[PDB]
Design a protein around this ligand. Structure first.
Ligand SMILES: *[C@@H]1O[C@H](CO[C@@H]2O[C@@H](C)[C@@H](O)[C@@H](O)[C@@H]2O)[C@@H](O[C@@H]2O[C@H](CO)[C@@H](O[C@H]3O[C@H](CO)[C@@H](O)[C@H](O)[C@@H]3O)[C@H](O)[C@H]2NC(C)=O)[C@H](O)[C@H]1NC(C)=O
Ligand SMILES: *[C@@H]1O[C@H](CO[C@@H]2O[C@@H](C)[C@@H](O)[C@@H](O)[C@@H]2O)[C@@H](O)[C@H](O)[C@H]1NC(C)=O
Ligand SMILES: *[C@@H]1O[C@H](CO)[C@@H](O)[C@H](O)[C@H]1NC(C)=O
Ligand SMILES: CC1(C)CO[C@@H](CC(=O)O)CN1
Lengths: 407, 403
């Protein structure tokens, strides 16, 4: 007769490096309203949220993790956003027999099961860009690839995965270059070694520095193809930076024809998911809940992953259901949830939701190409099913893609 | 007699390898506590050190810290943190509970970042503290050109990175910078090829034997060469594939080892009224069957830093403790400012901090036939070097030339 309250311990980055909590806290709040109103999901239970602002800071998050664990009520799951907060909470979690579900962590290191035994994420690993990269090399028949990176853990781990994935396809990494903050030397070294197909892994500020150096060394044109990350701001190369020698037109020349990969966070199809909402309905409903405009709201693109994380949890809790008897000293309930979370298969607002053996989300990637100082959607790739959605919109100098070597 | 509770954090279990550090330092901590109590230095109060086992594990260490806050007394500060990743986790979070931390064994350079670890202090010099000492050694012998040999592991690359800033604006050139992961031979041949004579090595005990074997094969030993490497390796580390033991020892001859000084060599009375030598005898008696630890003097001086900090804090409150919960930002700031005033002569030498970092003593050793022999010491406070007159030796008529 009485619905028992079951609690989620969440952490939302309202500020810091990735202030994703701005759109992810309301998206979670919407998902809890939708799950609790559905009598076919958890009829005997009411899913409740207890949350804190991590400020995208592990030190700050350490204070709140204590607050979540050392105060009543007992929480059945932990929900962090930032990769640094997730590395802290997902490693600690085993001591309290807690499942950890992240809605925003892209760090490849979080795919380690020995270290993060109860970890799941509706956000894919930064390594999800690699199967799409290998497939694009296979499509355009390239077996020799160059790689330039900014010295960060995420980019190092992404390249380490790229290595083992190219070997599987009969492709080899010719030259590997790196920089901490200044990229003149690896760019100079790329012209030196006559590198043609180049995968560049760096943040937006460093991308600008890379591309100004790319200009000077004339590392752009018919001979050159750049593989970059698709989540920079629109017209990132057009953005004014005092540390930049180059001009907007100069940068526009250097960037032309480069390929980007990005995770699909919102289903491009007009279909209805488990919530019975469409992609556009979710976006409309979420905009109404926001104090500021979507463009001024951190983590607006990631918001569907936060929404679907609640559904993944609700569906897992539904597959199990003795939820009130959960204790930090006992594994029994945890183990059943893990099994239910492992076997997740449903349609969310972000698309089909499935986790690999590491607890990492499997999703579509959107392939784009910079055609005339603007990105054009050249395709989509599904890693699990080896399905490449190809649109005849890719454009190259002369009429076709260049080769990896001398020819 | 009200308590002044201190949160002791360290590995203590026999099942954990670094449990030997935590156990090896406890007789030293027991001796400092015992004295401070007898003398009633903290009258009316008494020092209440509570021990919690981190087990040298991130998850267990965090729960040990959390459990101490929940079930333990209202601690005024943190004493300890031994393992680098555990200490980093606790040290970053400190301000959340207004807890000042003093470590005696965590030497990771990372902890010097006061933007990330503002409430963290340490009585032990960090791994980077050898770099100003090496600079003085290079200046002393007129070595203006050096080569570097580093292992591609964070512990060593942190040290090499700091060297760049220490040698900048100084009359010293790094002619060749070489890195290795598993085999040093390629890098050792590149060093030989570039005619490098003075080598600053940063690598582990296992790689050192490989380095010296490559040095024997490349003839990068004798009168024309000086290897300056870590001084923290275990004794007889070389004894423990292509080279013969005699060939390894020939190439090892004359290497300079650099590390922090475990205890002061000065036969002067410290804050406790005992000389470092007297303290060492008292420690050796108290330890019994427990294996000694090189961090014992730092743990001993650490207890004195706490007692002296609490004294200064008590004075500051009297110039205007029980009510302190991890809520009192003011008391945390009082304790913070009091620890920054630390200036006394302890068993490890003069105990002074420079932005939470210890300004201490760096030991120089030289491999002479069968073992490492102390050849000198660097005083970081004075920025001075003292070479022991008739100990340090060279195979030639003069010390080697840098080119
Ligand atoms: C999924 O989508 C449809 C929801 O469309 C609407 O969108 C919501 C966001 C909200 O605005 C809500 O108010 C809207 O209805 C639902 O499909 C509607 O389902 C109704 C079921 O009858 C139907 O209505 C009438 O249907 C016939 C005549 O229209 C009558 O006999 C009946 O009495 C109602 O008058 C309506 O036409 C239909 N519209 C569409 C476009 O499908 C759909 O059921 C929902 N799925 C669920 C809840 O499982
Ligand atoms: C931090 O201490 C810094 C250096 O202070 C001097 O050295 C210590 C060891 C004592 O002898 C002290 O009396 C000296 O002033 C100061 O520069 C800094 O301002 C201090 N801040 C404090 C104590 O709040
Ligand atoms: C909830 O679980 C119950 C029992 O397995 C099942 O009948 C119901 O269909 C589930 N709800 C959903 C949406 O799967
Ligand atoms: C695609 C991006 C920007 C990658 O970083 C994520 C934040 C993080 O990994 O901490 C959120 N989404």
């Amino acid at each position: 007769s009485e619905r028992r309250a079951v609690y989620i311990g969440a952490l939302f980055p309202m500020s810091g490096g990735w202030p994703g909590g701005q759109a992810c806290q309301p998206a979670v709040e919407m998902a809890l309203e939708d799950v609790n109103s559905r009598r076919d999901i958890l009829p005997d239970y009411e899913l409740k949220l207890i949350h804190h602002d991590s400020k995208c800071d592990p030190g700050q998050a350490t204070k709140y993790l204590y607050e979540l664990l050392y105060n009543d009520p007992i929480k059945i799951i932990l929900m962090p956003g930032c990769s640094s907060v997730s590395t802290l909470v997902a490693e600690a979690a085993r001591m309290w027999n807690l499942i950890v579900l992240s809605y925003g962590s892209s760090s490849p290191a979080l795919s380690n099961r020995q270290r993060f035994p109860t970890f799941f994420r509706t956000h894919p690993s930064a390594t999800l860009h690699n199967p799409t990269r290998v497939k694009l090399f296979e499509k355009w028949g390239w077996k020799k690839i160059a790689t330039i990176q900014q010295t960060t853990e995420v980019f190092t781990s992404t390249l380490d995965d790229l290595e083992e994935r190219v070997k599987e396809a009969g492709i080899e990494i010719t030259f590997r270059q790196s920089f901490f903050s200044d990229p003149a030397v690896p760019v100079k070294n790329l012209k030196r070694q006559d590198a043609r197909i180049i995968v560049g892994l760096f943040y937006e500020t460093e991308a600008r520095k890379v591309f100004c150096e790319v200009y000077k060394e004339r590392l752009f044109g018919k001979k050159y193809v750049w593989f970059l990350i698709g989540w920079y701001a629109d017209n990132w190369f057009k953005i004014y930076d005092p540390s930049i020698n180059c001009t907007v037109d100069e940068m526009t020349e250097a960037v032309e024809g480069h390929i980007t990969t990005e995770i699909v966070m919102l289903n491009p199809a007009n279909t209805r998911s488990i919530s019975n909402m469409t992609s556009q309905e979710f976006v409309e409903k979420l905009t109404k809940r926001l104090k500021r405009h979507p463009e001024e709201t951190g983590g607006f693109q990631e918001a569907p992953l936060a929404y679907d994380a609640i559904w993944a949890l609700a569906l897992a809790l539904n597959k199990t259901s003795r939820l009130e008897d959960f204790n930090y000293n006992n594994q029994t309930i945890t183990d059943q949830i893990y099994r239910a979370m492992n076997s997740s298969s449903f349609e969310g607002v972000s698309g089909h939701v499935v986790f690999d053996a590491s607890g990492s989300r499997m999703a579509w990637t959107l392939i784009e190409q910079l055609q005339g100082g603007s990105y054009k959607k050249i395709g989509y790739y599904d890693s699990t099913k080896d399905d490449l959605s190809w649109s005849k919109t890719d454009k190259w100098i002369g009429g076709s893609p260049p080769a990896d070597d001398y020819k | 007699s009200p308590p002044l509770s201190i949160m002791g954090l360290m590995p203590l279990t026999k099942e954990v390898a670094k449990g030997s550090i935590g156990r090896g330092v406890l007789p030293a901590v027991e001796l400092a506590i015992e004295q401070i109590r007898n003398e009633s230095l903290l009258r009316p109060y008494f020092l209440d050190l509570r021990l919690y086992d981190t087990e040298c594990d991130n998850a267990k260490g965090l729960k040990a810290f959390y459990d101490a806050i929940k079930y333990g007394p209202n601690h005024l500060m943190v004493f300890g943190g031994v393992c680098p990743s555990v200490t980093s986790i606790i040290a970053e979070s400190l301000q959340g509970w207004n807890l000042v931390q003093l470590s005696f064994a965590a030497t990771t350079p990372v902890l010097a970042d006061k933007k990330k670890y503002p409430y963290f202090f340490r009585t032990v010099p960090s791994d980077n503290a050898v770099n100003p000492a090496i600079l003085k050694l290079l200046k002393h012998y007129q070595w203006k050109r050096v080569g570097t040999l580093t292992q591609d592991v964070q512990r060593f690359s942190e040290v090499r990175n700091d060297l760049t800033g220490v040698l900048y604006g100084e009359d010293i050139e790094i002619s060749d910078t070489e890195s290795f992961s598993n085999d040093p031979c390629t890098s050792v041949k590149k060093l030989k090829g570039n005619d490098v004579r003075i080598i600053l090595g940063q690598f582990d005990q296992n790689m050192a034997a490989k380095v010296f074997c490559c040095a024997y094969e490349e003839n990068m030993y004798g009168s024309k060469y000086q290897w300056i490497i870590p001084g923290w390796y275990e004794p007889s580390w070389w004894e423990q594939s292509r080279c013969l033991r005699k060939n390894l020892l020939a190439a090892m001859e004359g290497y300079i080892g650099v590390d922090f000084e475990p205890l002061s060599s000065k036969q002067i009375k410290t804050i406790s009224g005992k000389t470092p030598q007297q303290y060492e005898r008292e420690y050796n008696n108290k330890r019994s069957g427990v294996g000694p630890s090189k961090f014992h003097g730092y743990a001993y001086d650490g207890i004195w830093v706490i007692a002296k900090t609490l004294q200064r804090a008590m004075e500051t409150l009297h110039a205007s403790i029980q009510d302190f919960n991890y809520t009192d930002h003011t008391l945390g700031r009082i304790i913070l400012n009091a620890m920054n005033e630390t200036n006394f002569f302890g068993v490890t030498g003069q105990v002074v901090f420079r932005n939470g970092e210890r300004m201490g003593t760096i030991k120089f050793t030289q491999f002479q036939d069968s073992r490492e022999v102390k050849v000198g010491e660097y005083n970081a406070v004075a920025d001075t070097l003292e070479i022991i007159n008739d100990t340090i030796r060279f195979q030639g008529s003069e010390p080697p030339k840098d080119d």
